[PDB]
Amino acid sequence: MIDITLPLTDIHRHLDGNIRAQTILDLGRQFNIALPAQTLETLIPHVQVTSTEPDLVSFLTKLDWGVKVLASLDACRRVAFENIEDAARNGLHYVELRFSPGYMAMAHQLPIAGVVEAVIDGVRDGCNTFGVEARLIGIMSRTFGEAACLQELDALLAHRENITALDLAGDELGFPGSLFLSHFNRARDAGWHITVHAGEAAGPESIWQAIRELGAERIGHGVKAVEDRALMDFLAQQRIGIESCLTSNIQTSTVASLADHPLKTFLEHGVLASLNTDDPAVQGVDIIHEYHVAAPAAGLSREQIRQAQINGLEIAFLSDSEKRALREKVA
Ligand SMILES: OC[C@H]1O[C@@H](n2cnc3c2N=CNC[C@H]3O)C[C@@H]1O
Ligand SMILES: [Ca+2]
Ligand SMILES: [Ca+2]
Numbered sequence: 001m002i003d004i005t006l007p008l009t010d011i012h013r014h015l016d017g018n019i020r021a022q023t024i025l026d027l028g029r030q031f032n033i034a035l036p037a038q039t040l041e042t043l044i045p046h047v048q049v050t051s052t053e054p055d056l057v058s059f060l061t062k063l064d065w066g067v068k069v070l071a072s073l074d075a076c077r078r079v080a081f082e083n084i085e086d087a088a089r090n091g092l093h094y095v096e097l098r099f100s101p102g103y104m105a106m107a108h109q110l111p112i113a114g115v116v117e118a119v120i121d122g123v124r125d126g127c128n129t130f131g132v133e134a135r136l137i138g139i140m141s142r143t144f145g146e147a148a149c150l151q152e153l154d155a156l157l158a159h160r161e162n163i164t165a166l167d168l169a170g171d172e173l174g175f176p177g178s179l180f181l182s183h184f185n186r187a188r189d190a191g192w193h194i195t196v197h198a199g200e201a202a203g204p205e206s207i208w209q210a211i212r213e214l215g216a217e218r219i220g221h222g223v224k225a226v227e228d229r230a231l232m233d234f235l236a237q238q239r240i241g242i243e244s245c246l247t248s249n250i251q252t253s254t255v256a257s258l259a260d261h262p263l264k265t266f267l268e269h270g271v272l273a274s275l276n277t278d279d280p281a282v283q284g285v286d287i288i289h290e291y292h293v294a295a296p297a298a299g300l301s302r303e304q305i306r307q308a309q310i311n312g313l314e315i316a317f318l319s320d321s322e323k324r325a326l327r328e329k330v331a
């Protein structure tokens with residue numbers, strides 16, 4: 001169940017992996033961009049996983065059409081606004097929206113810092129309209145190499161007072177986290193919080209690298225952490241959050257079945273693991289499905305599902321006052 005007396009969060013949620021299919025059609029028409037399909041029914045298999053993808057890199061290609069229609073900064077503002085609307089429609093009280101401004105800007109060569117500003121604007125408008133609380137996480141898309149990631153870093157730094165955290169996402173095996181030592185040194189000097197996609201396609205060594213070298217306070221996925229008990233202990237003792245995305249892990253073939261997902265194991269070891277969506281539009285599911293379908297299939301008890309719900313706020317990049325206000329309201 002979702003406990004309606006506790007805040008509902010989603011802290012691993014890619015804005016640019018959540019571009020509505022109707023919005024892809026609308027923007028393609030507005031900009032006269034040729035699309036692979038002309039109706040929702042025929043567009044879906046090009047923009048959404050229909051069963052599973054064979055690996056992480058294949059899954060990543062499903063986001064491409066959404067960002068290929070972003071031909072202006074106003075289009076970026078629209079998708080940011082619609083992302084807050086989607087969060088509101090799912091009963092979320094608090095979201096952290098992560099986005100790769102370089103990935104969003106790539107197709108039409110938009111100014112990368114302008115994409116950051118447009119996302120900030122659209123999220124501000126959406127929060128004002130719907131009342132969802134939100135913070136922004138900038139992503140460096142490792143897939144495009146260290147120099148492209150520096151361009152994204154510079155764009156986010158030009159808006160650093162509006163960005164709460166930095167993340168590394170994309171092709172984990174092709175671009176190990178060790179390559180981004182300098183990018184994260186600069187992020188920590190800027191005072192940003194740190195999360196890192198790690199231990200999804202690669203092993204526990206990638207998680208250790210994210211913690212010890214990149215300064216990660218949370219780990220995106222971290223599925224392979226169960227292979228190292230010392231790592232499990234370190235996560236629990238140091239209160240390093242785990243951002244679990246059950247359906248995503250099925251759809252990237254990171255786990256073959258939810259019955260073998262490590263989320264239950266994390267919670268039994270005292271790790272602050274939370275339930276999240278990842279890429280709602282691409283996956284065809286949102287947070288309600290993760291709680292009511294994916295989490296029971298992953299073997300979690302009712303109490304464990306509640307603990308994951310609590311952990312999402314506990315690991316949020318929010319002040320004690322902000323966390324208290326959300327808890328006091330919903331109680
Ligand atoms: O926000 C868009 C960026 O994030 C990547 N990205 C989007 N969803 C995921 C990503 N990366 C790694 N693991 C799978 C899943 O969690 C794609 C793009 O670079
Ligand atoms: Ca509110
Ligand atoms: Ca009280």
Ligand SMILES: [Zn+2]
Binds near residue numbers: 012014220278
């Ligand atoms: Zn992700």
